[PDB]
Amino acid sequence: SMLTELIASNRRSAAIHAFVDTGLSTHFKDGIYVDISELSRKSGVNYARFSRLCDFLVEMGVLVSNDNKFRLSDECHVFANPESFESFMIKLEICSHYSNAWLMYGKSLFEDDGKSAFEMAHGRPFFEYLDGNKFLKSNFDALMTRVSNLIVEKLLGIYDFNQHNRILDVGGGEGELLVRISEKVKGKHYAVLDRYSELPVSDNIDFINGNFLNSIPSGYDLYILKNVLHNWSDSDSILILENFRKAMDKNSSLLLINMVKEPEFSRSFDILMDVLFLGKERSFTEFEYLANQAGLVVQETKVIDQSYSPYSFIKLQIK
Amino acid sequence: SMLTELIASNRRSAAIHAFVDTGLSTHFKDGIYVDISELSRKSGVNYARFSRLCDFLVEMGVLVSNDNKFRLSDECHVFANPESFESFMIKLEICSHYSNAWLMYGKSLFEDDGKSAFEMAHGRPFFEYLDGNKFLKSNFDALMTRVSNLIVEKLLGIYDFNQHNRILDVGGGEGELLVRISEKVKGKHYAVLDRYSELPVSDNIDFINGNFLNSIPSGYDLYILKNVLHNWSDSDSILILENFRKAMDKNSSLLLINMVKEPEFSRSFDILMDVLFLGKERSFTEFEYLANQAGLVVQETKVIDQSYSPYSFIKLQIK
Ligand SMILES: Nc1ncnc2c1ncn2[C@@H]1O[C@H](CSCC[C@H](N)C(=O)O)[C@@H](O)[C@H]1O
Ligand SMILES: Nc1ncnc2c1ncn2[C@@H]1O[C@H](CSCC[C@H](N)C(=O)O)[C@@H](O)[C@H]1O
Ligand SMILES: COc1cc(O)cc2c1C(=O)c1c(O)cccc1C2=O
Ligand SMILES: COc1cc(O)cc2c1C(=O)c1c(O)cccc1C2=O
Ligand SMILES: [Cl-]
Ligand SMILES: [Cl-]
Ligand code: NA
Ligand code: NA
Ligand code: NA
Ligand code: NA
């Protein structure tokens, strides 16, 4: 029935995980039709049991069935690429750590101790836990790198980065957003601030071990804060933006770049942010309120279209 | 995007689990519109965070919004009743044991040692593992009891049980099917065979600790095997049906009752049976083949429509 299949939504995620995480999906590059008998002989996957998984993947629209063969659907071409953001998303979505966090979600709703479902499961908040877990950290940082790579071309197209001299990407992770910007916009100073036990190394990138809850370093005319605030409470968000306002002079600019809450799109990500961080999706208006409270003003507003989600682009300056 | 929401199908299951497993759904009995402010004050659930969950549950069609209040959709009325099959399905669907089984599914497809994804995760096959896990055993047996209770009315309607005298339900679990048949079909001898560490007690029900892989007790004129064969390989299924043929005389009948593989219905359950048992869903044709190979012939076939799945009713007799 519709309802029992809704209850069993997890089966769709777990099916995709088996198909993509094993690397079986990498045999379906360039929309090629795959004979499962041949794939079974080449890969050593069980023919009868994988054929049954392929029938389910057809039902979900991941595979297209023709002439006793299967191809990826046009939109699922990304599953053939293990470097795609969707491949890294699949690795994490139903990993044990996320699963066990989701199992504490119900209980998390009856607590007001500021402990995420993730912390209730694993004993530390998300990013603190990732310091001790290479699987989660490597794959999460990899995922953030892939979605950074996807938006950078559109970002360069809607904002003049050439006007700026000193650029700091705050919570920039592996720092791939600025590495890509630095390749198109030459002759600037490029710095990336995050939590680093060992500093990353990249050509003409200054990696700074820091904490945006404590302080943001002064002496940059461009600050970038991309996909950070949705990991934080309203109070922690205001604290971060206040730390920016203190670090900024009259001429400096802050680019607040985030996935933005719109009524046309699914709320599933809003619930994941609650489970992992006690974070939330915010509308442009809700972002603007937090900026105002922190003593910042909106100079420019733009919407950037990504395949998976709309993005708010908010240029901020001190009042 | 549709694709990222497909990858994140698990979030739908986890949201329903948080809503139902906490008992919050039990505040929505009799299609009543609930004020979330009042529910938050009464239950101690966080208002803002539960309201966000309610928005996701409306999106999924579990909740219906009117006048800033929420009711269960008509089909989701079952979530208000903690004794419903749908409540027990929710409890098990994303429990840690099922999740960890699903995470071994990919690896299971490359092995041919007869070890299920579940056994690979947990160290024993499903039913053996349940002997040492009260959470899994009690909830699984409860789920089977609820779905037995749902089918009994239509089953009595399509077959004359009054013609029989000695009736054995094989792998009958808690014995709910025969207990319900017994209270509408009086004056018979009722027996239930399963794997019991302690024999259940029920009025005029003979509970038998047995093993249908080894032997079925003879002398019954009606045998019932409901929702067993989908837990077993084709070879183990033939063995079970062979043990019936040995136990049966000319006059005895075997009612093979099972969820049946139809093209119109989802293959998700077929994949779950692979993960948990190296089992599978079968068409009437495939069931008839197994029966024939065991030396049983089809006397009559009927289709029983249940809300969640179509059922095959197959009356079998010795050659
Ligand atoms: N207290 C803190 N100080 C600095 N960085 C922090 C932090 N807590 C979390 N972070 C970092 O914040 C980042 C959030 S994920 C976003 C990464 C990057 N801006 C992008 O959009 O692709 C992570 O890299 C995490 O390590
Ligand atoms: N070797 C074995 N011998 C007997 N019963 C077995 C068995 N292995 C598993 N079972 C039982 O088979 C049942 C499968 S679930 C089906 C239960 C019931 N017939 C119903 O339709 O609701 C479980 O109760 C399980 O304990
Ligand atoms: C916990 O996951 C995230 C944390 C972030 O700070 C930002 C993103 C994510 C995501 O999981 C994510 C995703 O799964 C798909 C597309 C984008 C993102 C994030 O930007
Ligand atoms: C392990 O799960 C099952 C094993 C069975 O032998 C029969 C059923 C199930 C189910 O999980 C199940 C379900 O989740 C929802 C409706 C029916 C069933 C079974 O009949
Ligand atoms: Cl997402
Ligand atoms: Cl089901
Ligand atoms: Na719970
Ligand atoms: Na189940
Ligand atoms: Na889970
Ligand atoms: Na889990």
Tab-separated table of N, CA and C in Angstrom, chain A residues 1-18 22 24 43-46 49-50 52-53 55-56 59-60 62 75-76 78-79 85-86 89-90 93-96 99-100 102-103 105-112 265-272 274 278-280 307-308, chain B residues 1 3-18 22 24 43-46 49-50 52-53 55-56 59-60 62 75-76 78-79 85-86 89-90 93-96 99-100 102-103 105-112 261 265-272 274 278-280 307-308:
chain	number	residue	atom	x	y	z
A	1	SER	N	0.859	-1.217	0.000
A	1	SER	CA	0.000	0.000	0.000
A	1	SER	C	0.882	1.250	0.000
A	2	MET	N	0.283	2.417	-0.239
A	2	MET	CA	0.985	3.726	-0.173
A	2	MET	C	1.579	3.892	1.231
A	3	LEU	N	0.771	3.685	2.277
A	3	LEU	CA	1.156	3.940	3.693
A	3	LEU	C	2.304	3.009	4.109
A	4	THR	N	2.199	1.705	3.849
A	4	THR	CA	3.241	0.726	4.263
A	4	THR	C	4.542	1.038	3.514
A	5	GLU	N	4.456	1.452	2.247
A	5	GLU	CA	5.653	1.819	1.446
A	5	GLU	C	6.219	3.144	1.974
A	6	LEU	N	5.369	4.059	2.453
A	6	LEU	CA	5.828	5.305	3.124
A	6	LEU	C	6.618	4.922	4.382
A	7	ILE	N	6.053	4.055	5.226
A	7	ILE	CA	6.715	3.547	6.466
A	7	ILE	C	8.079	2.950	6.092
A	8	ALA	N	8.140	2.258	4.948
A	8	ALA	CA	9.317	1.524	4.427
A	8	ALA	C	10.138	2.396	3.462
A	9	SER	N	10.022	3.724	3.546
A	9	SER	CA	10.815	4.677	2.720
A	9	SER	C	12.310	4.345	2.836
A	10	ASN	N	12.772	3.966	4.033
A	10	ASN	CA	14.186	3.592	4.322
A	10	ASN	C	14.695	2.577	3.288
A	11	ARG	N	13.846	1.647	2.833
A	11	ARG	CA	14.243	0.562	1.890
A	11	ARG	C	14.786	1.168	0.591
A	12	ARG	N	14.237	2.300	0.140
A	12	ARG	CA	14.683	3.004	-1.096
A	12	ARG	C	16.123	3.485	-0.895
A	13	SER	N	16.394	4.123	0.246
A	13	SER	CA	17.727	4.677	0.602
A	13	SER	C	18.747	3.535	0.671
A	14	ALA	N	18.377	2.428	1.318
A	14	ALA	CA	19.254	1.262	1.563
A	14	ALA	C	19.536	0.541	0.238
A	15	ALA	N	18.549	0.489	-0.662
A	15	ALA	CA	18.687	-0.073	-2.026
A	15	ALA	C	19.734	0.732	-2.802
A	16	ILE	N	19.581	2.058	-2.839
A	16	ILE	CA	20.533	2.978	-3.534
A	16	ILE	C	21.926	2.793	-2.918
A	17	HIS	N	22.015	2.690	-1.588
A	17	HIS	CA	23.299	2.551	-0.849
A	17	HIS	C	24.030	1.285	-1.312
A	18	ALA	N	23.334	0.148	-1.348
A	18	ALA	CA	23.891	-1.147	-1.802
A	18	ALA	C	24.409	-1.001	-3.239
A	22	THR	N	28.796	-0.035	-3.128
A	22	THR	CA	29.558	-1.235	-3.574
A	22	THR	C	30.352	-0.922	-4.846
A	24	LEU	N	28.889	-0.879	-7.839
A	24	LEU	CA	28.141	-1.530	-8.949
A	24	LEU	C	27.642	-0.455	-9.927
A	43	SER	N	32.012	-8.737	-12.059
A	43	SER	CA	32.080	-8.124	-10.702
A	43	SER	C	31.977	-9.178	-9.591
A	44	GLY	N	31.404	-10.350	-9.880
A	44	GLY	CA	31.172	-11.411	-8.881
A	44	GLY	C	29.932	-11.154	-8.035
A	45	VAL	N	29.081	-10.195	-8.419
A	45	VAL	CA	27.767	-9.970	-7.748
A	45	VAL	C	26.846	-11.137	-8.123
A	46	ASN	N	26.019	-11.584	-7.178
A	46	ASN	CA	25.056	-12.697	-7.376
A	46	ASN	C	23.996	-12.246	-8.387
A	49	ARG	N	19.992	-12.307	-7.203
A	49	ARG	CA	19.713	-11.368	-6.088
A	49	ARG	C	19.922	-9.926	-6.567
A	50	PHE	N	20.930	-9.664	-7.405
A	50	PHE	CA	21.173	-8.305	-7.955
A	50	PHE	C	20.083	-7.960	-8.979
A	52	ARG	N	16.985	-8.832	-8.828
A	52	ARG	CA	15.850	-8.433	-7.953
A	52	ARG	C	16.053	-6.992	-7.461
A	53	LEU	N	17.272	-6.620	-7.066
A	53	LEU	CA	17.583	-5.222	-6.660
A	53	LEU	C	17.348	-4.295	-7.860
A	55	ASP	N	15.250	-4.643	-10.373
A	55	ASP	CA	13.776	-4.508	-10.534
A	55	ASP	C	13.268	-3.402	-9.593
A	56	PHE	N	13.748	-3.369	-8.346
A	56	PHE	CA	13.361	-2.347	-7.336
A	56	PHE	C	13.872	-0.968	-7.780
A	59	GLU	N	11.664	0.357	-10.446
A	59	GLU	CA	10.422	0.838	-9.778
A	59	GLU	C	10.654	2.242	-9.197
A	60	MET	N	11.844	2.511	-8.652
A	60	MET	CA	12.209	3.816	-8.027
A	60	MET	C	12.600	4.844	-9.100
A	62	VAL	N	15.521	4.820	-10.761
A	62	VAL	CA	17.012	4.912	-10.790
A	62	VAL	C	17.522	4.208	-12.054
A	75	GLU	N	18.913	11.467	-14.987
A	75	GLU	CA	19.191	12.285	-13.773
A	75	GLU	C	20.075	11.493	-12.799
A	76	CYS	N	20.057	10.159	-12.859
A	76	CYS	CA	20.843	9.280	-11.950
A	76	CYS	C	22.230	8.975	-12.538
A	78	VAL	N	24.751	10.575	-12.158
A	78	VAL	CA	25.652	10.972	-11.031
A	78	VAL	C	26.065	9.743	-10.204
A	79	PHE	N	25.228	8.703	-10.133
A	79	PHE	CA	25.525	7.460	-9.371
A	79	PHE	C	26.681	6.681	-10.013
A	85	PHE	N	28.760	14.471	-5.690
A	85	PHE	CA	28.249	14.826	-4.341
A	85	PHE	C	27.211	13.771	-3.920
A	86	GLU	N	26.405	13.272	-4.864
A	86	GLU	CA	25.323	12.286	-4.588
A	86	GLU	C	25.927	10.969	-4.072
A	89	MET	N	26.877	11.776	-0.461
A	89	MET	CA	25.577	11.930	0.246
A	89	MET	C	25.055	10.542	0.635
A	90	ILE	N	25.112	9.592	-0.301
A	90	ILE	CA	24.634	8.190	-0.109
A	90	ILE	C	25.469	7.509	0.985
A	93	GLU	N	24.194	9.202	4.421
A	93	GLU	CA	22.738	9.329	4.706
A	93	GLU	C	22.275	8.208	5.647
A	94	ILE	N	22.645	6.947	5.387
A	94	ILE	CA	22.177	5.793	6.215
A	94	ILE	C	23.360	5.116	6.922
A	95	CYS	N	24.525	5.770	7.008
A	95	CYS	CA	25.666	5.282	7.832
A	95	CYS	C	25.178	5.120	9.279
A	96	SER	N	25.778	4.196	10.035
A	96	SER	CA	25.337	3.802	11.400
A	96	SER	C	25.181	5.047	12.285
A	99	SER	N	21.985	6.974	11.383
A	99	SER	CA	20.897	6.037	11.764
A	99	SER	C	20.647	6.125	13.273
A	100	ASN	N	21.707	5.982	14.074
A	100	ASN	CA	21.619	5.963	15.559
A	100	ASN	C	21.191	7.343	16.069
A	102	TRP	N	19.161	9.394	14.291
A	102	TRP	CA	17.715	9.394	13.939
A	102	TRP	C	16.908	8.620	14.991
A	103	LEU	N	17.471	7.550	15.563
A	103	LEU	CA	16.783	6.722	16.593
A	103	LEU	C	16.641	7.493	17.915
A	105	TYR	N	16.030	10.876	17.856
A	105	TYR	CA	15.302	12.103	17.431
A	105	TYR	C	14.036	12.269	18.281
A	106	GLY	N	13.196	11.233	18.328
A	106	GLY	CA	11.966	11.213	19.142
A	106	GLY	C	12.235	11.631	20.578
A	107	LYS	N	13.256	11.044	21.210
A	107	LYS	CA	13.647	11.333	22.616
A	107	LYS	C	14.206	12.759	22.716
A	108	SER	N	14.944	13.220	21.701
A	108	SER	CA	15.570	14.570	21.672
A	108	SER	C	14.496	15.662	21.793
A	109	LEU	N	13.275	15.402	21.307
A	109	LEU	CA	12.152	16.378	21.261
A	109	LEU	C	11.596	16.650	22.670
A	110	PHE	N	11.871	15.777	23.645
A	110	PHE	CA	11.368	15.881	25.041
A	110	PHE	C	12.444	16.456	25.974
A	111	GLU	N	13.629	16.782	25.446
A	111	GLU	CA	14.768	17.355	26.216
A	111	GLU	C	14.949	18.826	25.823
A	112	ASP	N	15.411	19.657	26.761
A	112	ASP	CA	15.725	21.093	26.529
A	112	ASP	C	17.114	21.391	27.111
A	265	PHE	N	9.858	23.407	-1.594
A	265	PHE	CA	10.885	22.347	-1.416
A	265	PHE	C	10.619	21.579	-0.116
A	266	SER	N	11.137	20.353	-0.052
A	266	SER	CA	10.948	19.394	1.069
A	266	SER	C	11.545	19.967	2.356
A	267	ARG	N	10.934	19.646	3.498
A	267	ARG	CA	11.405	20.033	4.853
A	267	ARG	C	12.334	18.955	5.430
A	268	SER	N	12.638	17.885	4.682
A	268	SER	CA	13.428	16.733	5.198
A	268	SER	C	14.790	17.224	5.714
A	269	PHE	N	15.422	18.180	5.025
A	269	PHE	CA	16.766	18.697	5.391
A	269	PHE	C	16.683	19.491	6.701
A	270	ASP	N	15.597	20.243	6.894
A	270	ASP	CA	15.304	20.990	8.147
A	270	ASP	C	15.305	20.020	9.335
A	271	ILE	N	14.725	18.830	9.165
A	271	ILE	CA	14.652	17.816	10.257
A	271	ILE	C	16.047	17.214	10.471
A	272	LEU	N	16.798	16.924	9.403
A	272	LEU	CA	18.183	16.389	9.521
A	272	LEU	C	19.040	17.381	10.324
A	274	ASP	N	18.056	19.520	12.559
A	274	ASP	CA	17.595	19.382	13.964
A	274	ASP	C	18.283	18.165	14.604
A	278	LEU	N	20.840	20.425	16.271
A	278	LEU	CA	19.776	21.363	16.734
A	278	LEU	C	19.840	22.635	15.876
A	279	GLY	N	20.165	22.473	14.592
A	279	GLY	CA	20.146	23.548	13.589
A	279	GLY	C	18.794	23.607	12.908
A	280	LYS	N	18.684	24.388	11.835
A	280	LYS	CA	17.401	24.596	11.117
A	280	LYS	C	17.652	25.264	9.767
A	307	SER	N	20.875	22.367	-8.297
A	307	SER	CA	19.988	21.237	-8.690
A	307	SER	C	19.170	20.771	-7.479
A	308	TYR	N	19.825	20.635	-6.323
A	308	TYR	CA	19.287	19.986	-5.097
A	308	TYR	C	18.499	20.987	-4.239
B	1	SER	N	15.882	18.616	-4.658
B	1	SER	CA	15.514	17.917	-5.926
B	1	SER	C	14.826	16.590	-5.598
B	3	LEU	N	15.656	13.684	-6.830
B	3	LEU	CA	16.747	12.680	-6.692
B	3	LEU	C	17.314	12.715	-5.267
B	4	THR	N	17.647	13.895	-4.736
B	4	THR	CA	18.236	14.024	-3.374
B	4	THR	C	17.207	13.577	-2.328
B	5	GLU	N	15.917	13.848	-2.551
B	5	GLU	CA	14.821	13.414	-1.641
B	5	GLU	C	14.635	11.897	-1.758
B	6	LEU	N	14.884	11.317	-2.936
B	6	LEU	CA	14.890	9.842	-3.115
B	6	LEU	C	16.049	9.253	-2.301
B	7	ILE	N	17.255	9.811	-2.429
B	7	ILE	CA	18.455	9.361	-1.658
B	7	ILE	C	18.135	9.434	-0.160
B	8	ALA	N	17.383	10.464	0.248
B	8	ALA	CA	17.041	10.788	1.654
B	8	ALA	C	15.663	10.221	2.027
B	9	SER	N	15.200	9.179	1.331
B	9	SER	CA	13.922	8.479	1.631
B	9	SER	C	13.882	8.079	3.114
B	10	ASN	N	15.014	7.630	3.673
B	10	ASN	CA	15.169	7.238	5.104
B	10	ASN	C	14.579	8.305	6.043
B	11	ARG	N	14.684	9.590	5.697
B	11	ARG	CA	14.235	10.699	6.585
B	11	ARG	C	12.723	10.596	6.822
B	12	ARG	N	11.956	10.153	5.821
B	12	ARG	CA	10.481	9.962	5.933
B	12	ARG	C	10.191	8.902	6.999
B	13	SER	N	10.876	7.757	6.928
B	13	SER	CA	10.718	6.627	7.880
B	13	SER	C	11.081	7.100	9.294
B	14	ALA	N	12.186	7.840	9.434
B	14	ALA	CA	12.743	8.263	10.738
B	14	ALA	C	11.803	9.285	11.393
B	15	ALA	N	11.223	10.191	10.603
B	15	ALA	CA	10.245	11.209	11.059
B	15	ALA	C	8.989	10.511	11.599
B	16	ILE	N	8.446	9.540	10.857
B	16	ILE	CA	7.256	8.753	11.297
B	16	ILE	C	7.633	8.005	12.578
B	17	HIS	N	8.837	7.426	12.647
B	17	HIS	CA	9.319	6.670	13.836
B	17	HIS	C	9.321	7.590	15.067
B	18	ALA	N	9.859	8.808	14.945
B	18	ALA	CA	9.913	9.796	16.049
B	18	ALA	C	8.488	10.117	16.523
B	22	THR	N	7.472	7.449	20.047
B	22	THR	CA	7.406	8.296	21.275
B	22	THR	C	5.991	8.283	21.868
B	24	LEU	N	3.586	10.197	20.595
B	24	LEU	CA	2.994	11.522	20.257
B	24	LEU	C	1.771	11.312	19.352
B	43	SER	N	2.481	17.256	27.095
B	43	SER	CA	3.419	16.121	26.865
B	43	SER	C	4.866	16.506	27.195
B	44	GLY	N	5.197	17.801	27.154
B	44	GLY	CA	6.566	18.306	27.377
B	44	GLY	C	7.423	18.220	26.123
B	45	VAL	N	6.823	17.949	24.959
B	45	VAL	CA	7.545	17.979	23.654
B	45	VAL	C	7.864	19.447	23.347
B	46	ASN	N	9.053	19.719	22.808
B	46	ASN	CA	9.497	21.083	22.428
B	46	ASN	C	8.580	21.603	21.316
B	49	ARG	N	10.317	22.746	17.720
B	49	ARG	CA	10.970	21.606	17.024
B	49	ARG	C	9.911	20.582	16.598
B	50	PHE	N	8.870	20.363	17.404
B	50	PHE	CA	7.772	19.429	17.042
B	50	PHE	C	6.936	20.031	15.906
B	52	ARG	N	7.999	21.890	13.488
B	52	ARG	CA	8.814	21.642	12.271
B	52	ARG	C	8.591	20.198	11.802
B	53	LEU	N	8.575	19.231	12.726
B	53	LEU	CA	8.270	17.809	12.406
B	53	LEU	C	6.870	17.731	11.783
B	55	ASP	N	5.173	19.934	10.125
B	55	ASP	CA	5.242	20.495	8.745
B	55	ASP	C	5.725	19.407	7.774
B	56	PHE	N	6.738	18.626	8.160
B	56	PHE	CA	7.287	17.512	7.343
B	56	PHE	C	6.231	16.404	7.220
B	59	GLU	N	3.625	17.452	4.710
B	59	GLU	CA	4.278	17.264	3.384
B	59	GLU	C	4.146	15.795	2.949
B	60	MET	N	4.369	14.848	3.866
B	60	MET	CA	4.333	13.380	3.601
B	60	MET	C	2.884	12.877	3.529
B	62	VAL	N	0.893	12.408	6.213
B	62	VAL	CA	0.564	11.729	7.504
B	62	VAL	C	-0.377	12.640	8.303
B	75	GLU	N	-6.148	7.509	6.442
B	75	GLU	CA	-5.411	6.225	6.294
B	75	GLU	C	-4.379	6.088	7.423
B	76	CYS	N	-3.892	7.202	7.978
B	76	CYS	CA	-2.867	7.204	9.057
B	76	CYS	C	-3.521	7.176	10.447
B	78	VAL	N	-4.324	4.691	11.984
B	78	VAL	CA	-3.656	3.509	12.607
B	78	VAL	C	-2.498	3.957	13.510
B	79	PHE	N	-1.855	5.096	13.220
B	79	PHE	CA	-0.708	5.621	14.011
B	79	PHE	C	-1.161	6.060	15.409
B	85	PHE	N	-0.865	-2.916	13.512
B	85	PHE	CA	0.275	-3.563	12.811
B	85	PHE	C	1.243	-2.463	12.342
B	86	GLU	N	0.719	-1.312	11.902
B	86	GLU	CA	1.538	-0.196	11.356
B	86	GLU	C	2.472	0.341	12.452
B	89	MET	N	5.251	-2.212	12.827
B	89	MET	CA	6.050	-2.129	11.573
B	89	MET	C	7.071	-0.996	11.701
B	90	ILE	N	6.621	0.153	12.209
B	90	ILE	CA	7.431	1.386	12.447
B	90	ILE	C	8.561	1.065	13.425
B	93	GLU	N	11.072	-1.334	11.512
B	93	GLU	CA	11.547	-0.945	10.156
B	93	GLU	C	12.923	-0.275	10.238
B	94	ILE	N	13.139	0.639	11.190
B	94	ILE	CA	14.425	1.396	11.265
B	94	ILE	C	15.128	1.156	12.608
B	95	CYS	N	14.762	0.108	13.357
B	95	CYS	CA	15.498	-0.308	14.582
B	95	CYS	C	16.959	-0.584	14.200
B	96	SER	N	17.879	-0.466	15.161
B	96	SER	CA	19.344	-0.592	14.942
B	96	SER	C	19.667	-1.894	14.194
B	99	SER	N	18.702	-1.712	10.421
B	99	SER	CA	19.646	-0.716	9.851
B	99	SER	C	21.001	-1.375	9.570
B	100	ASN	N	21.557	-2.064	10.571
B	100	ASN	CA	22.904	-2.684	10.495
B	100	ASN	C	22.869	-3.850	9.498
B	102	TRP	N	20.812	-3.799	6.775
B	102	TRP	CA	20.776	-3.063	5.482
B	102	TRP	C	22.193	-2.626	5.085
B	103	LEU	N	23.023	-2.224	6.054
B	103	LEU	CA	24.407	-1.745	5.790
B	103	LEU	C	25.302	-2.894	5.301
B	105	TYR	N	23.984	-5.316	3.272
B	105	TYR	CA	23.250	-5.815	2.076
B	105	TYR	C	24.179	-5.781	0.858
B	106	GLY	N	24.812	-4.632	0.603
B	106	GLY	CA	25.774	-4.461	-0.500
B	106	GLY	C	26.814	-5.565	-0.500
B	107	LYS	N	27.470	-5.791	0.642
B	107	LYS	CA	28.527	-6.823	0.802
B	107	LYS	C	27.916	-8.219	0.623
B	108	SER	N	26.680	-8.430	1.088
B	108	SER	CA	25.978	-9.743	1.041
B	108	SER	C	25.794	-10.202	-0.412
B	109	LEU	N	25.632	-9.270	-1.357
B	109	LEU	CA	25.374	-9.577	-2.790
B	109	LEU	C	26.613	-10.193	-3.460
B	110	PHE	N	27.801	-10.054	-2.860
B	110	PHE	CA	29.086	-10.556	-3.417
B	110	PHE	C	29.520	-11.857	-2.726
B	111	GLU	N	28.732	-12.358	-1.770
B	111	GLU	CA	29.002	-13.625	-1.034
B	111	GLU	C	28.001	-14.691	-1.491
B	112	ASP	N	28.400	-15.965	-1.443
B	112	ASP	CA	27.553	-17.121	-1.843
B	112	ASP	C	27.677	-18.222	-0.782
B	261	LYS	N	3.783	-12.134	-5.150
B	261	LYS	CA	4.515	-11.200	-6.041
B	261	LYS	C	3.633	-10.868	-7.249
B	265	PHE	N	2.601	-4.116	-7.629
B	265	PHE	CA	2.967	-3.817	-6.218
B	265	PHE	C	4.488	-3.677	-6.080
B	266	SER	N	4.916	-2.980	-5.024
B	266	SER	CA	6.331	-2.612	-4.760
B	266	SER	C	7.175	-3.868	-4.516
B	267	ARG	N	8.437	-3.837	-4.952
B	267	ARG	CA	9.432	-4.924	-4.751
B	267	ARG	C	10.227	-4.690	-3.458
B	268	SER	N	9.902	-3.655	-2.671
B	268	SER	CA	10.674	-3.283	-1.452
B	268	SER	C	10.709	-4.472	-0.478
B	269	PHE	N	9.579	-5.156	-0.270
B	269	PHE	CA	9.473	-6.288	0.689
B	269	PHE	C	10.348	-7.459	0.222
B	270	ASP	N	10.387	-7.713	-1.087
B	270	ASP	CA	11.252	-8.748	-1.714
B	270	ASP	C	12.710	-8.496	-1.308
B	271	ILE	N	13.154	-7.235	-1.307
B	271	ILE	CA	14.558	-6.881	-0.946
B	271	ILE	C	14.753	-7.067	0.564
B	272	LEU	N	13.783	-6.669	1.395
B	272	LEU	CA	13.862	-6.868	2.869
B	272	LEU	C	14.035	-8.363	3.174
B	274	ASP	N	15.369	-10.673	1.277
B	274	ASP	CA	16.771	-10.988	0.897
B	274	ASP	C	17.693	-10.607	2.061
B	278	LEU	N	17.807	-14.169	3.269
B	278	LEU	CA	18.021	-14.654	1.878
B	278	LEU	C	16.725	-15.332	1.408
B	279	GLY	N	15.581	-14.760	1.791
B	279	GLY	CA	14.249	-15.163	1.318
B	279	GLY	C	13.880	-14.375	0.079
B	280	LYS	N	12.627	-14.476	-0.356
B	280	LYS	CA	12.140	-13.791	-1.577
B	280	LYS	C	10.614	-13.832	-1.608
B	307	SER	N	-5.036	-4.641	2.695
B	307	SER	CA	-4.714	-3.203	2.491
B	307	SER	C	-3.279	-3.071	1.963
B	308	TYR	N	-2.332	-3.779	2.586
B	308	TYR	CA	-0.866	-3.602	2.405
B	308	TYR	C	-0.334	-4.459	1.247
